[PDB]
């Protein structure tokens, strides 16, 4: 994949937007375009930069961030800027938070799965992301388009049990993360927020078979897919190609996914009545459109 060698003098650094897995991300300008720059912190991070640069150049897909080029003094990546920020901020960030619909929730998960399915179908060997979570999912086009970034080649809430076991893992670990993200956008809750302390407490819980609470009034095909994705045995989880197909076909019953995020939302989180939670999104329209198609 062809890419530019950037002269640092052509870069005009504006403001710091965030701090990813490694390095610092900053808003900037380069040749009229609005860009984002991931810059090195410690000289030790150099190995991670070679990996991410090797991979981002190799990949080309609408749901994975564009790499425009790389500057080597100082060593930094020049990528496309995501105007809407991360999904984590949209979900759980500072007030005021945007209102979103079930349609948005489904579309975000579809676009995410589409990007991952592409990664799993690389030649000659598949790419495993290893770090799928809302902080690494970015939003553009008024919140309607999702991009994947921060390749994994505080993540315990999304991590498959075989990964933190140090055990042998396949691309099916990405599928587990996707299941958690799906639960997360439907409920607008932080997964395992009730479990306090440090990371090992989550890891212990998930290792015993602790999963997120089931959702009240959730459509059985969605529930079926969600719980399949978070199976202990990686074999019992569906492939991403299957997920992409299912989610594409469900979008028939979720119109309006192309409406930009623009409405305010004052969000208070109720407690879980039984062992279940109420969704943030509403499924009344789904059931209406479904019954119209089915008998």
Residue numbers in the known binding site are 17-25, 38
Residue closer to ligand 6JV, measured from CB, 27 or 245: 27
**What one-character DSSP code corresponds to residue 284?**
H
Residue closer to ligand 6JV, measured from CB, 146 or 222: 146
* Distance, CA of 19 to CA of 23 (rounded, Å): 6
Residue, CB closest to ligand 6JV: 85
Q: After which residues is the chain broken (C to N over 2.5 A)?
A: 153
Min dist CB 144 to ligand 6JV, Å, is 16
Whether 258 is catalytic: no
- Summarize as ranges the residues that interact with ligand 6JV (CB under 6 A): 17-18, 20, 25, 36, 38, 65, 79, 81-82, 85-86, 89, 138, 149-150
Query: What 3-state DSSP class applies to 43?
Result: helix
Min dist CB 17 to ligand 6JV, Å, is 4
Long-range contacts of 266-273 (CB under 8 A, 24+ apart): 266/95, 266/96, 267/97, 267/188, 269/189, 272/213, 273/216
Residue closer to ligand 6JV, measured from CB, 89 or 239: 89
Which two three-digit tokens encode residue 56? 């981002």
Which two three-digit tokens encode residue 218? 């959730």
Min dist CB 67 to ligand 6JV, Å, is 9
Query: CB 37: neighbour CB atoms within 10 A?
Result: 25
Extended strands (E) in 19-143: 24-30, 33-39, 67-72, 75-80, 97-98, 137-140
Which one of the listed residues 7, 34, 131, 258 is annotated catalytic? 131
Binding region for ATP:
17-25, 38
Min dist CB 4 to ligand 6JV, Å, is 16
Residue closer to ligand 6JV, measured from CB, 27 or 211: 27
Residue closer to ligand 6JV, measured from CB, 48 or 246: 48
At residue 138, φ and ψ (nearest 5 deg) are: -110, 155
* Distance, CA of 48 to CA of 177 (rounded, Å): 22
Min dist CB 38 to ligand 6JV, Å, is 5
Q: Which residues are catalytic?
A: 131
């Amino acid at each position: 994949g062809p890419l530019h060698m950037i002269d640092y003098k052509e870069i005009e650094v504006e403001e710091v937007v965030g701090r990813g897995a490694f390095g610092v991300v900053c808003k900037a300008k380069w040749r009229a375009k609005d860009v984002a720059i991931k810059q090195i912190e410690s000289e030790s991070e150099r190995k991670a930069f070679i990996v991410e640069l090797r991979q981002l150049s190799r990949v080309n897909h609408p749901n994975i961030v564009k790499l425009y080029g790389a500057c080597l003094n100082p060593v930094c990546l020049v990528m496309e800027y995501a105007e809407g920020g991360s999904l984590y901020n949209v979900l759980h960030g500072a007030e005021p938070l945007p209102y979103y619909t079930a349609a948005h929730a489904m579309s975000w998960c579809l676009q995410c799965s589409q990007g991952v399915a592409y990664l799993h179908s690389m030649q000659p060997k598949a790419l495993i992301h290893r770090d799928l979570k809302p902080p690494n999912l970015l939003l553009v086009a008024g919140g309607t388009v999702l991009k994947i970034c921060d390749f994994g080649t505080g993540s315990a809430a999304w991590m498959a049990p075989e990964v933190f076991e140090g055990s042998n893992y396949s691309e099916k670990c990405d599928v587990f993360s996707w299941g958690i993200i799906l639960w997360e956008v439907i409920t607008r809750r932080k997964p395992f927020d009730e479990i306090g302390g440090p990371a090992f407490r989550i890891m212990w819980a998930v290792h015993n078979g602790t999963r997120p609470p089931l959702i009240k009034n959730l459509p059985k095909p969605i529930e079926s897919l969600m719980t399949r994705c978070w199976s202990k045995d990686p074999s019992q989880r569906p492939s991403m190609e299957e997920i992409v197909k299912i989610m594409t076909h469900l979008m028939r019953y979720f119109p309006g996914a192309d409406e930009p995020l623009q409405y305010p939302c004052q969000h208070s989180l109720p407690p879980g009545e039984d062992g279940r939670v109420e969704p943030y999104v509403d499924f009344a329209e789904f059931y209406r459109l479904w019954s119209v198609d089915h008998g």
